[PDB]
Structure formats: C-alpha cells, structure tokens
Design a protein around this nucleic acid. Sequence first.
RNA 1: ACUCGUGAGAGACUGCCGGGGUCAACUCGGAGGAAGGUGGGGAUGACGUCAAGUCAUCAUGCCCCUUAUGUCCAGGGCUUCACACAUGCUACAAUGGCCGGUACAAAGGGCUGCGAUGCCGUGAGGUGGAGCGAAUCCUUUCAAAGCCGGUCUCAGUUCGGAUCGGGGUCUGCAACUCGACCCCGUGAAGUCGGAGUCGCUAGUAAUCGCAGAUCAGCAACGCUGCGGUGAAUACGUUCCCG
Lengths: 126, 60, 155, 116, 82, 99
Amino acid sequence: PIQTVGRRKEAVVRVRLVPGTGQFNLDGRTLENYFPNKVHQQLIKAPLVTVDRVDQFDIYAHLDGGGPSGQAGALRLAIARALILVQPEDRPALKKAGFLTRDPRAIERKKYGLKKARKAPQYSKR
Amino acid sequence: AKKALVHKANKKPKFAVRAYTRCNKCGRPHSVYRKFGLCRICLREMAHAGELPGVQKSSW
Amino acid sequence: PRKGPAPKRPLVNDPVYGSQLVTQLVNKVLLEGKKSLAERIVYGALEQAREKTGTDPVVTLKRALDNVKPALEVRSRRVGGATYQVPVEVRPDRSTTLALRWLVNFSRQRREKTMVERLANEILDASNGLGASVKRREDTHKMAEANRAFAHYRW
Amino acid sequence: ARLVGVDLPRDKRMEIALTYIYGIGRTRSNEILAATGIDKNMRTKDLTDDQVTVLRDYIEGNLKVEGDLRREVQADIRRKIEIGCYQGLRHRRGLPVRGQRTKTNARTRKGPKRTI
Amino acid sequence: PRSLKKGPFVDDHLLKKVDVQNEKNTKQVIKTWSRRSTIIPDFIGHTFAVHDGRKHVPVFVTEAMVGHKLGEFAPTRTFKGH
Amino acid sequence: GQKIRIRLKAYDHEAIDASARKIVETVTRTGASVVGPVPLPTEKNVYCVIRSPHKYKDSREHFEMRTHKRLIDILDPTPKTVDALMRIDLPASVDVNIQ
RNA sequence: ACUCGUGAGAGACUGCCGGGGUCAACUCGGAGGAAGGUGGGGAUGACGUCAAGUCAUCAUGCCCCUUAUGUCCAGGGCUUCACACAUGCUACAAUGGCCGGUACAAAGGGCUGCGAUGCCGUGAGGUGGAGCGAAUCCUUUCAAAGCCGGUCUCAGUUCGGAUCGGGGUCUGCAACUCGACCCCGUGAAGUCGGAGUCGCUAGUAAUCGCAGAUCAGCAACGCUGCGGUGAAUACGUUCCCG
C-alpha cells in the first residue's frame, strides 16, 4: 500500500496510487468533472509531464480545506512526493524545476486597531 | 455608581426587560461580559492580578 | 528601498504560449483579484486577432509592442520652488511596462461596449500602427526631444 | 401600442413594458401575465389586439392604476396632513416623516444645498 | 407593527372613567398622562388632554384620525425655525 | 457487559495528566480494562478588552481561556473498581464526570 | 495503513564552498534542504517628554448640599435642523444586470439555549417536537467570488437605490416622537468627482462571504477574528514630513 499527504495554505489532500490506466478519481469525479480549470489542469499535469510517465497511474484523492487553487496545489505536491517515493531516480528532476519546494505562505493575522493586516485607517492632519 | 442605583439594581425589576448588567465589583453598566459579570476594566485588572481560574494573556 | 534595490520578482512561464508577455498583460488587466476571467478575456482577444489577421499571435504582439515601446521619459526635479523637466532614457523593461499599461488603461475607452473586442481591436490597431498607443508614444518622444535642453543636471 | 391611454415603447419586454405604468412594477407584471397567459419572449412589435384586450380586462378587474392611484395616495396624504398627525406636520416642513435624521442626511427630502 | 392578537391597547384608568361618564349620560374632558394608548372608537365622542412633559394638550378626536396613538397627533418638542 | 466513559477536563496540563496517570494506575491495581486517555479538542474562548479607561480605543489587550478535555473508557466493569472509584482524590482544577 | 484531535522530540544554526573583503565583521552567488541567512506574524514599549487624558471604573485631601445638589416615581430628550467638518457603506454598470445548474474554506457559538422533519405561508413566520450541557445534535452534508447554459446592448438603463403610499411579521407590560425585518408601487440624486489629500513593498492591497463580543429585538454599514481568489512597480536621495 502507498498513501501520500499534501498541504497548501489550509488545504489538506490525501492521495492513493494504482499502476492502472490514465484516469483519476477526485472523490468520485474525474480530472475534468472536478477542478474544471485548464490552468489547474496543466498544474496537476506538471509532475507527470516532468517525469514523462503520464497515463501510467490512477490516483484516488480525498480532499479537505481550502479552495480550488489551494487544493490543486496540494494535490500537485502530494502526487509529486508520491512519485518521488515510488521512483527515487526522478528526485534530481523536480528539484530542478522546484516542485519539491513546499510553499510556506499563509494568511497573515488581521491586527486590531486597523482595517485588515497592514491596511490602516485614513489619517487627517486636523 | 450611586448607592441608590446599586440598590435598585440589586432590587429585582418588576418587568423582565427592566433588568441590566450592573457590573459586580464596581457597578459600571457598560461593557459587562456575561461570562464573568464584570466590567471590562475590572476584568482586565483582576486577570492581570492572577486571581481568575483560566484567564491568561493571548498571543498568536 | 532606501538602502538598495530589492531583488526582482520572477515571472512564471506562460503554459499555453511559452512567452511571458501574455501573462504580464493578463496580470496587469487583472483587477478585483480574478485570474480566470482576465485570462479568458485576453485569450478571447488573442483568438479574435488570430481569426482577423491570419498570423501567429506571438510575433504580431511582439512587433506591435516594439512599435509602441517608448524610448525616453521626462522627469521632474524641483529647485527653489520651481520645477525642471529633464529627459532620461528608459530601460527596455519599464518601456514595455509603460506601453502595456497605456494599452490596458486606454482599452476602456473604445465605444464598442465589450472589453474582449476592445482589446482585440486595439491590439490590431497597434499592430497596424494607427492605435492611440502610437499617439502617446509620439507625444512622449515629442516631449523628450523638445525639452532636451534641460539635462545639465545629469540624471 | 397603447396602455391605458399611454404610449407603449417600441422595443421593450412586456415584463418591462408593464413596469412603465404607475401601478405595475416587477412582481405585478409577472402575476398579471401568469393570470392572463401571455408568452414573455415576444416584443411590443408583435403585441396584437387579443393580448391588449385581455390585458386591460385583467388590469380593470385586479387593482387601481394611473390617475386613481395618484388621487388615492393624495387622499391618504390629505387625511394625514389636516388632522394634526405627526406625519402630516413632518410633511408640511419638508422633513422626513419616518423619524429619520436631518443633521447631515435627508438631502433628497429638503432638496439641493443652500449654503449659509 | 403592533401585534393585533393582543388587541388594541388601553390602560384601565381612562377606560373606567369613560365607562362611569357614558353610563351616567355624561361627556366631559379626559386628562391623561399616557401617550402609548391607542384611539378607541368609543372615545371618538370625547376629548383627551394628553401630557407632553410640562402640561396637557387637549385633542378632540374624530373619525379621521382613528387607528393611531395619541402622540401621533400631539407633538412634544418645540422648534421655531432659525 | 457494560462499558463506561469518563470525561476528564482541566485548564492545567500538569494536573490533568497527573489525574489520568493516577486513575490508570488505580484501575491497573484493581484489575479492570481501560482503553486509555484519548485526547480531545481543546476549547478556546477569546476576548478583547480596552487597556485604557476613558478613550484611546486603538490600544487593547486580548484574553484567552483554554480547556483541555479527554475521555477514559473502561471495559469489564469490575465491581471493586466501582467501589474504589469515587474515593480517588483528584486535583482542584480537574473535573471528571461519568457517561 | 492516511489526515485529524494532543503530548514529547528533531530541524536553520553563515552549517559548507567561491568571489569581494584589512584573512575582519560583513555582502552576494552556489550546494543540500520545507524553508538561507532574525523562514512569517504576535507578545514584550528603558531612562525621558507633553502640568497630555481619565475626580463619570474605583479610591483619594480640601471645599459644597445635608431637610437638600439627597432621594422613588410617570411622560419627554440625548434621533430636534437653513448649515460645516470627519469616518464609513452603497452607486454612476457590460471586467456588468437579471434567470437555472454546478463544487471546494476556516473559525466560532449554543439551557428556560442552538433548535432539524412534517403541517400552512411570496417571507419574516404560527403548531409542536426528535439531538445535545455538548469532536455526538444545530449553524443546511456548512457561504460568495468561481464555471457552464439563456437573455439584456448602452438609455437615468432589466443601473442605481433614496423619499413617499397601502398592508404585515417577530420581540417587548408597553413599537407615534424612536426597534428590526416582509409584500406591492412611482422611482430622486448620481455620468468617474476642482484646489487638495489618504492606505499600501507578499499571500499585501483589492474584492467576497462567514463567525464572535455587547443583545429579548436591533440603528451593526461599527469593532475583533477567519478563510477564498489574488498582480504592479521600488531607477535612486534631489525635494515634503517625523
């Protein structure tokens, strides 16, 4: 058994792999039925295309937290780490494109006495 | 708060809506939390005095 | 920015065309924080250009921006309460930035009542050289060349 | 065409065209149309006599529109402005009658600004 | 607005006084310190001196102003322009 | 035949852990089966107060209250465990109830 | 076996290399690595200054009333309006307006409290009640922006919402002055706003919804938080301010 976990700014995904055909399951939907974005499509294709072994794995994803782009990035990173695990020889490839660099960017706290984060109220000289 | 006002607050109102907060330690009718019953000033002063079971400085 | 220049931001390669000019344009036209709608607007304009000129979008946009890319700028320097206009040449990066900013800012004035055809029409006009961006470019060069005298401050 | 002596617009949806009258707006247009049975996808250019006759039959039979609405509103106002009613006195002085604020607001009630 | 389920509001004092008056074949001037009370059709033949804070304004009610509270026809604050 | 959960709560981590350890030791001494003190979500109440009386609103101070809760599940209801349950001494800040 | 709930620990330390270095601090580039140089943000505010603010949080010395400035109570005011200033929200629309479908967040709160199903309403809502003192039940499997399909085609607009009319719902002993919300209707100003001025350097501004405190109901567009999507330039101290 293989199971991998991905996280992206409050979105958490868990991916299971099968060596089956070139199709994906996202909580019961395919890659086009769910995440109907061409940009997200290329984003998720980027690991497999970089490793140049597309259409060789069937993934099953369980998703929580975040929105479209956050979960898309989380799935991308999770499947990238899963592929690195099953085939370590591709480790010096994704790092060349920086797909192993997890993104440590989140929502900055809204600070009291202000409007939001770094925004400030209007200042009047009189 | 005047002692007469404090006693009238201690006197149960003759109508349901005629009731208000009347902070316990001092008697400041504004900004009285229902969790403590204290005014915000008294709550802060007592919490900083280390005499409340659970309160502490917040930071995150 | 007082100590030194901040490191330049990287540009993500455009997945559909491979050149960053299109993603720069879509980032600039972006407003209210929506990538998808701006992307579809720019792509619709580019495909209208495809069906109206019959040539490759990358090269036509390239020489259009080259023909609307400014070369010199005018800067204000104040002494004794009175200002002076000095001409300074521009790095190509800010030149392209200003050209694209002019295009996007003035693409809200064409009177055909839809943004995507507005972009397609102005892109085609700049490709033909009759667009208003050419007019702003000529005005900027007129300002730069006419006031070439006041440059002894060397900035 | 005509709509109780008024000139219907040449190109307006009847769900929008019936808004042009003094008594029918958004919901009442659709309620009248459903109780009548006229397809809402056509234009005034095609609006023939049968639709017109069922239309004014229904509007006569349902409620009060045009001039009578104006005069009944005026009748209510006059009832409230000559019996000492608070709303009437607030009408008289050109100020909002719903107990609103006039320290800086109520521009459309008092009118344009007359700087002092 | 006011929930009609509880019925029109009238406190007991003036109701009892008007009961005494009209059961004694008499109509006089009623002075009250209440303003929240409504207009009763049995009161239309009478008049009410309603308090504004200093003294009482007398109002001779008719059928034209039925359905509103007393204070709706007795203004309180004074403002004589600028 | 019957299993019993006990909810076990406190602000303080030290006292709550000591109570759990003592109860587990007593159960082991008595001869009954327990799953163990499984962790539970920690409730947090957050409040804001104004530092200064009479104006200067922009300066405030935040307060927290944290309650750590856990469950202890016991199977095989040994009668001696029930006999020795309520006599167990517990810390002041720790509250345990049965379910 | 995987998140997760919560405890302990490992790990960012100029650690190594190369160029500038006074073989120095330090600066840049590279390697590995989740992060490269205080990784991101909170908490913490020295000696001092403004006779700054608070006798209305509390106490506090002196002076005052002491049969009153004390003191219970009914109604009314703090929302009054020809003006001016400040802080905000909604608009001047086609990057849009209206109609149906479609899928993903977080945090939080709940006992005379959250309150689901059915019963009837256009919608607040009237009937009564199952789950929970609460990772159990309710906030719809929790929203909007997003995407798809239909239409509107540039007008005071299928924009905008003000003022005004008729009729109601909820709470409250009591809704006129003076609570909120609902149905229907005419639909005012408003055409990107002069002199001038404001916030902001990475998950920031901008946009969108949700939650909480106070609250029976709310004037909340306020304040404190959460999450979604998310780019621009920074040449350089010449000038304006501390």
